[PDB]
Design a protein around this ligand. Structure first.
Ligand SMILES: *[C@@H]1O[C@H](CO[C@@H]2O[C@@H](C)[C@@H](O)[C@@H](O)[C@@H]2O)[C@@H](O)[C@H](O)[C@H]1NC(C)=O
Ligand SMILES: *[C@@H]1O[C@H](CO[C@@H]2O[C@@H](C)[C@@H](O)[C@@H](O)[C@@H]2O)[C@@H](O)[C@H](O)[C@H]1NC(C)=O
Ligand SMILES: *[C@@H]1O[C@H](CO)[C@@H](O)[C@H](O)[C@H]1NC(C)=O
Ligand SMILES: *[C@@H]1O[C@H](CO)[C@@H](O)[C@H](O)[C@H]1NC(C)=O
Ligand SMILES: *[C@@H]1O[C@H](CO)[C@@H](O)[C@H](O)[C@H]1NC(C)=O
Ligand SMILES: *[C@@H]1O[C@H](CO)[C@@H](O)[C@H](O)[C@H]1NC(C)=O
Ligand SMILES: [Mg+2]
Ligand SMILES: [Mg+2]
Ligand SMILES: [Mg+2]
Ligand SMILES: [Mg+2]
Ligand SMILES: [Mg+2]
Ligand SMILES: [Mg+2]
Ligand SMILES: [Mg+2]
Ligand SMILES: [Mg+2]
Ligand SMILES: [Zn+2]
Ligand SMILES: [Zn+2]
Lengths: 532, 532
């Protein structure tokens, strides 16, 4: 009966799947909400009406409606992030991996996919939870949530499109895991939520939101934090973008009711096809429909919550990758190429700075340019290329995360910080892109343990180390072996601010990750933009 | 009150001692038996009458009366094993190291010193328990027991000198630890007895003896096992040696009562001065007064007990050193020298074989000689030297221990076997002696953690690893980290017989330690001697 489980919403039957010369149980595509279709588009989720009979949970569910990246057709490096199942608004499902035999009450980890709040799928190869549940004896859950306009169209003060419903989808999955994970051998008192990019911002947002805090124990944030410049908009800006979406689709804009009626009448792809038109600027690393600072899911501004300690106080483990900007420059900035080392001219450097800091005035652009230009060597195309990578990564990922870690650490119960800088031996992207946004995920999830993926022995070892750090942290609140001779990952403290490199070489400890540039992005540039 | 403890026999006050930039509590010289003096010489121990007032336990006790090695005066390599306190028949005391602060109920380890059952001291520098109690948070006990004639004069059928009383001293200390270690923060349900050479044989003897089995949980045996050829004698041989001792001292030998009266009248040094005269042969690695196979402490023959599973079934960890014979050849075989590489001539090789296997007839000596001679190179003095080292070590330590491990493993609950082959960088003995009998003890007890002892960084790491293996085994029954990425020490199984090297290089696993030579010593030579 291992594969048959009775839950408070009905029965579900899973399937035995092989992994690494053994087997585990998978429960794929379990519904946790009413399908958010028809007149429920844009609305808060409603929990799934209990069902009669047995739910077949042996195959992955549909993916949510989303923009699909077709920039590099036939290229695995990009297509592996696209939906790999049929897309449907009927998409609020979760997946569970349970070791065999089924443990009594063990650690649970819930993965929240990223993708800028406009894309993402629980079903991607690189999110296959079987290697982690197996190797670490944890119950591994992956949830799903509406993205794009379907998840984040915000007409504040409307009850039909209030904003943040994709975050409420995530919370409802977390609620379901709370009420039902015991029946799978999971301990609901020991749930770790973890996610990368917009998934990592999401995790931070559940740390902040009062209504989410009780639904988990600890948290892991990978290349994302809640205060990221791309991860939220104001109530006014969210409303402006919702109106602009209707303007692009020739909607009645006279009232929220008439606008929403129109938008609910459009086919999903009609919304997706105009999604990027609502952005205020020509930009990179900016996404149209994202969480809104509404005074409900977020009681006050993120900064005031972080300053006053208005968040869940627990343990956190988080970090960034070395070359966070390269993916976004490749797709959106002039001069970059998948087929060449992408030496960037002075003129293209200037254009890239403006795309990268689209909200800045000309003085702010001059400040960024001065901060990142080597005036002893200003026409070095390699330095210009690497400088844009640092601008994009520092502004959008690394310095927001450092701001979050420094503010969080003042009230929290323990912080572990990493810098992932291993370039995979089998990477399909060119060398200049380095250690790319999202490319630690395959190590967290154990893909280098699979012989046919052609990683090296050192990379298999790194992946096992990482999975073990992650799962030991989920279980105890400390990535470290309780009494081992291997080098310890030191706590990050307000005073010494230590972090470790994650790579194949012997562990090195450092302090004050990119502190110089983060003073620029976190203190000086905001002040300059606010003054001028 | 950390240093004041109430025990069932009285109050004891200890002392705070520094260790490795911290501090711990030491309770030194606690009595566990009536002083075995006067008419109690040779008698079974009687437990210590409870005392009024507080016992001062801030300094080491006397050492037992024993032969003192003066072969190399002024040389630390030998003198560090000599008694370092005044010698006295009043010597049955134990020492306790307790971490600070005092734990509630933690793992206990009781050290049993070696020294061939004729020498040994709980107070030696290399037995300083403070580094182990501190570094591993265990309550570390060292006991003491009568040696030489005082502990092992055996007139079977006498009640005044019944034999084995040194083993009964050890048991009474184990009984005291059982009844009283809780008051020190020790868990009496989790006591590991460990010892080297005669201490390791002793440990095996408590595994075998019904009256000892309940007084501990697990056991560690270092370069010694109960079936070692030097570690016991027959009831008849023990009686012959007791009579011969009295013959050397012009005693009435007409009856046990008259013999024992005489021997109890002699000063301790009068007994020590003739101790070696009672041996039947010119020999090395043979000691005069040792445990006796009496039908009481040992219900039947050791071999029959090992075959029938008549022993405590638990977990054991044990092993040997690479060059067990060198110490004994240096002291007792012709051609060996502390001042030279000791190339051994054919004639001296033949003399050494006879000293090493003193019980063998000429055919048995020929068999040993053939087994260990390279007849393609018979006058190679280096090969002859190393061959004697192997003969002495294989016959007296390694092959008896392998016999014990193979018989024990058939009934026990888990076996971990090691081969220690690291030569200390600061060893005071010459190079030819290699990895000497007893020279793993300083690593087990943590001396390489002390900067002024001038070990290398690699040796400090090895010592920490070893202490951790040992203490993790005491606590769990498995030397291994429960879920670590460092290489595992595999169980020794009847079928694959795996063991590890203990040294500074990456862990290597092997099988069937010296199996070829041990078939010779454990099966063939006994058969040949029994036939001829
Ligand atoms: C459970 O589902 C297994 C795989 O099913 C596939 O997905 C379902 C939703 C259908 O669309 C089916 O046509 C697909 O092949 C089946 O192999 C299995 O038989 C199913 N079990 C039961 C009891 O229906
Ligand atoms: C406890 O003992 C400490 C060390 O003592 C030495 O050993 C004792 C047995 C005597 O022989 C003494 O002369 C030695 O110096 C003392 O320093 C300490 O004061 C003693 N404490 C008490 C309360 O007597
Ligand atoms: C976490 O909280 C516990 C309980 O108050 C406390 O003992 C511990 O020191 C805290 N650790 C950190 C790193 O804040
Ligand atoms: C791994 O390498 C082998 C060739 O040794 C190849 O057949 C296989 O397709 C490779 N796997 C990939 C590229 O994913
Ligand atoms: C030790 O004993 C336990 C309890 O019977 C058993 O489960 C375990 O497998 C045994 N281990 C060995 C190595 O014999
Ligand atoms: C260790 O070496 C130093 C010299 O660097 C010496 O003073 C000290 O006595 C040595 N310790 C010993 C030999 O135990
Ligand atoms: Mg309509
Ligand atoms: Mg870079
Ligand atoms: Mg692990
Ligand atoms: Mg350990
Ligand atoms: Mg008299
Ligand atoms: Mg040798
Ligand atoms: Mg340790
Ligand atoms: Mg671990
Ligand atoms: Zn209409
Ligand atoms: Zn007399």
């Amino acid at each position: 009966s291992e594969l048959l489980v009775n839950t408070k919403s009905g029965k579900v039957m899973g399937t035995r799947v092989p992994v690494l010369s053994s087997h585990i149980s998978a429960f794929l595509g379990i519904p946790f909400a009413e399908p958010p279709v028809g007149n429920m588009r844009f609305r808060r989720p409603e929990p799934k009406k209990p069902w009669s009979g047995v739910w077949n949970a042996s195959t992955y569910p549909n993916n949510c409606q989303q923009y699909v990246d077709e920039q590099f057709p036939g290229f695995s490096g990009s297509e592996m992030w696209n939906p790999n199942r049929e897309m449907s608004e009927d998409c609020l499902y979760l997946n569970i991996w349970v070791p065999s035999p089924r443990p009594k009450s063990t650690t649970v980890m819930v993965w929240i996919y990223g993708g800028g709040f406009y894309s993402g799928s629980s079903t991607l190869d690189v999110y296959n939870g079987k290697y982690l549940a197996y190797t670490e004896e944890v119950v591994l859950v992956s949830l799903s949530y509406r993205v794009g306009a379907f998840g984040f169209l915000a007409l504040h003060g409307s009850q039909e499109a209030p904003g943040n419903v994709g975050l409420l989808d995530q919370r409802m999955a977390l609620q379901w895991v709370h009420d039902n994970i015991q029946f799978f051998g999971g301990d609901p008192k020991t749930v770790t939520i973890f996610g990368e990019s917009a998934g990592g911002a999401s995790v931070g947002m559940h740390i902040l939101s009062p209504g989410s805090r009780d639904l988990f124990r600890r948290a892991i944030l990978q290349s994302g934090s809640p205060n990221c410049p791309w991860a939220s908009v104001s109530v006014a800006e969210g409303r402006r973008r919702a109106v602009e979406l209707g303007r692009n689709l020739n909607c009645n804009l006279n009232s929220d009711e008439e606008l929403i009626h129109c938008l609910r009448e459009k086919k999903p792809q009609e919304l997706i096809d105009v999604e990027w038109n609502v952005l205020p600027f020509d930009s990179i690393f900016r996404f149209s429909f994202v969480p809104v600072i509404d005074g409900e899911f977020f009681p006050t501004s993120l900064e005031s919550m972080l300053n006053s300690g208005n968040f869940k106080k627990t343990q956190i483990l988080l970090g960034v990758n070395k070359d966070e900007g390269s993916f976004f420059l490749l797709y959106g900035a002039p001069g970059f190429s998948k087929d060449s080392e992408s030496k960037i001219s002075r003129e293209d450097f200037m254009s890239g700075v403006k795309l990268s800091v689209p909200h800045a005035n000309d003085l702010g652009l001059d400040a960024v340019t001065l901060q990142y230009t080597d005036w002893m060597d200003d026409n070095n195309g390699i330095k210009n290329r690497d400088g844009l990578d640092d601008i994009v990564g520092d502004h959008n990922v690394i310095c927001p995360l450092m701001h979050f870690v420094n503010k969080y650490t003042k009230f929290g119960n323990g912080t572990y910080l990493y810098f992932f800088n291993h370039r995979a031996s089998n990477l399909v992207w060119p060398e200049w892109m380095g250690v790319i946004h999202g490319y630690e995920i395959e190590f967290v999830f154990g893909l280098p343990l699979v012989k046919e993926l052609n990683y090296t022995a050192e990379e298999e070892a790194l992946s096992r180390r990482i999975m073990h750090y992650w799962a030991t942290f989920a279980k105890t609140g400390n990535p470290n072996e309780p009494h081992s001779q291997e080098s310890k990952w030191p706590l990050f403290t307000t005073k010494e601010q230590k972090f470790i490199d994650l790579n194949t070489e012997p562990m090195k400890v450092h302090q004050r990750l990119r502190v110089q540039m983060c003073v620029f992005w976190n203190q000086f540039l905001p002040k300059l933009l606010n003054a001028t």
